[PDB]
Design a protein around this ligand. Sequence first.
Ligand SMILES: C[C@H]1c2ccc(O)cc2O[C@@H](c2ccc(OCCN3CCCC3)cc2)[C@@H]1c1ccc(O)cc1
Ligand SMILES: C[C@H]1c2ccc(O)cc2O[C@@H](c2ccc(OCCN3CCCC3)cc2)[C@@H]1c1ccc(O)cc1
Lengths: 225, 234
Amino acid sequence: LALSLTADQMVSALLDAEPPILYSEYDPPFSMMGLLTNLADRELVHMINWAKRVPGFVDLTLHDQVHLLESAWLEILMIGLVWRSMEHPGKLLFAPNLLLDRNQGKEGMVEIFDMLLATSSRFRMMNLQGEEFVCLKSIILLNSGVYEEKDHIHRVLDKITDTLIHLMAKAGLTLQQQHQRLAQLLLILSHIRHMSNKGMEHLYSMKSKNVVPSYDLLLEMLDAH
Amino acid sequence: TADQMVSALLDAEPPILYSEYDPPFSEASMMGLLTNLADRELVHMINWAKRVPGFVDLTLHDQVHLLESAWLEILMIGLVWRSMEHPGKLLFAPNLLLDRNQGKSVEGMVEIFDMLLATSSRFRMMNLQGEEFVCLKSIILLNSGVYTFSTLKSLEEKDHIHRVLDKITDTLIHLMAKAGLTLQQQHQRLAQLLLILSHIRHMSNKGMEHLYSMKSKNVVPSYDLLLEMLDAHR
Ligand SMILES: C[C@H]1c2ccc(O)cc2O[C@@H](c2ccc(OCCN3CCCC3)cc2)[C@@H]1c1ccc(O)cc1
Ligand SMILES: C[C@H]1c2ccc(O)cc2O[C@@H](c2ccc(OCCN3CCCC3)cc2)[C@@H]1c1ccc(O)cc1
């Protein structure tokens, strides 16, 4: 029934659903990966609660909800990082008390640092709006793991598309500018998927205990009724 | 114009190549046939790219850069396209049509086979048109490596690529409008089509991982090779 929402209501619901910005657990004597892992793990929880507030998401089975999160969790983290890093050229704001440049990024991380920084710059160049950001983040959640259930996801995706066009029309853009900007934003998501892939490779190469959140962890965080 | 754009892309389409003929197939020679096929389609791909409007306007260095980034994606989407009318099978060639069971012979291949098969199914579900296909393939060429290029020349390059990309978007909208779609249906299908590219990028990455794991002499076409094919003389 979350499809009956209007473009205005869709945008409003997403804006309110935005997760908070977290701080790194560092006693402000400067171990970097440890800080990032701790932050990522804590930001995962809020992501799950955010996802539940994305219109149409909880209409899916818990099984399908977990699958989507399994596919999209790193992508969602990255675009979130890029977003809050927009107003800080050449630096990645992992947290308000943890803003790093590519020099600090220097084993195998600098390559991914540069990709993230380039995406942030692109956001900057395009003057990405908050209303557009929440739409793009929602698209990632629903689309990343899509390869009655599948049809519902596409209907939700279509609704977000209508909303993006609505926002751009509201911003005064012409019709040609609207479909052009829509394409530009969606093409950015392909790059974000690319970063997530390379990021996964890099994280696995670190030989940590685990990289991906388990099915049970995601399920538990969802908090079924 | 959008119409001129579509025509140029259609005419630029590379031919469908065949696997060698000898009157049986064996799972041991499978990777060999695919490698042979892939290498031969690479040559035609370079010639295709040169005929993509705006591509040859770029420096040879940046042309090579784009192909390095997109070459596997382009191979995959081409494979998915000609496999579209063949449910449950991948038409690598008219005389080389494989199922996922044959994929099991090569360690790690079924996973990538399934992703390709899923993409073919999506094309089928969406009733993807040939005009739309060539648009998507050109977009891959120009966009895939545009995010991994500070020189003043590079700034000119990226802006040019974005202008070409914008034109292809206009062409897609033109095609769908011509197809009778409403404005809302146009924006929805455009998004649907562009989101598929995210999956294709995903397959290319996983495919690259798989190819490297095979410990062959090389996986990616070298800069000098791409340059050599791209750096034609007069
Ligand atoms: C993008 C970066 C990021 C974004 C937001 C954030 O709050 C923290 C952050 O730090 C990096 C990161 C570090 C570790 C990590 O995985 C640790 C394992 N957890 C992942 C969730 C379950 C278990 C995931 C991401 C992470 C990263 C990802 C890939 C990479 O190659 C380097 C750093
Ligand atoms: C997508 C598949 C494909 C597409 C079109 C085609 O004509 C052949 C084809 O077979 C698979 C393939 C096999 C080998 C290959 O690389 C051989 C190295 N050359 C690549 C270009 C220069 C060197 C690249 C792709 C290839 C594939 C790719 C990744 C993978 O994990 C499994 C099969």
